[PDB]
């Protein structure tokens, strides 16, 4: 099914932002991006700059399959999660 890649990406974003898990990347900060569809490249470019972590490693691979101010990785992933769910609903799987 062609919605599998996005479904799995969404599901990974959820897994790594569970309340139980520690604050993502120890509160490292990344460039915020404009979430407007076809933003997978830009999202990868923000995340690939976070060295180590490992918690976002799977998200980084997942974004690869798709490809002026800073915010916490936690907030970045949560805002991206919400956006992708809306894309999923509208049938944008690419």
């Amino acid at each position: 099914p062609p919605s599998t890649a996005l479904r799995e990406l969404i599901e990974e974003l959820v897994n790594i932002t569970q309340n139980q898990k520690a604050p993502l990347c120890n509160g490292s900060m990344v460039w915020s991006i404009n979430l407007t569809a076809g933003m997978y490249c830009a999202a990868l470019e923000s995340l690939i700059n976070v060295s180590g972590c490992s918690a976002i490693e799977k998200t980084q691979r997942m974004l690869s399959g798709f490809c002026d101010t800073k915010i916490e990785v936690a907030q970045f992933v949560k805002d991206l999660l919400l956006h992708l769910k809306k894309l999923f609903r509208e049938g944008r799987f690419n």
Partner: antibody
Amino acid sequence: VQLVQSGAEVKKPGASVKVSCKASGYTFTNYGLSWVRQAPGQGLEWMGWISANNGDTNYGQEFQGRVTMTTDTSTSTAYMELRSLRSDDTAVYYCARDSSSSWARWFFDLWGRGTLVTVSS
Amino acid sequence: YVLTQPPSVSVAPGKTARITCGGNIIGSKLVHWYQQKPGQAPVLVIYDDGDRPSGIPERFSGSNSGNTATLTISRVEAGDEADYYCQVWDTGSDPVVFGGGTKLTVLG
């Protein structure tokens, strides 16, 4: 922007009811309608969805076979017919605006005021 | 797909009420919330996890993470007494799922 529902109906067991829902203030055929019922003092139950664009339908699993949804574009009206009625179909039947998409179901922003159907011998 | 709500929540006037909606990876779904008073149709209060339609008080907010979505109502009033229903779309056998409903009692 409103959904206008037909009046309360009293029906015998085994009869059929057709409830109407008229749309006002928006472009009817750019959306869908979901039907949701509620037996008195109980929860919401989704009955199905119809596209006002093409008349495609998707019925709730518990209602497959028993329900028919139709639209009349000329009057911006949707119809829900429930057949082979039983005492346990006594409920308020609501129509609500939904997306015209056959892929995804959306939130229900606009609701009709509901039509009580009482099923009694 | 199954949504689970507590049947009831009680709250004192002016306090904050929290209503949960549990489902497996509900965080991966867009959650909507309806308020319903007796004799009236449901009213959409929160859509897409945490957005408010126009005319809904800013006292209403929504969160969705992991296996739990939450509707929060700050500074509760007697006019907030109602049944609250969470709702999702699912790609499986039931395309629309409602939670069982939570009765919010405001202890006046």
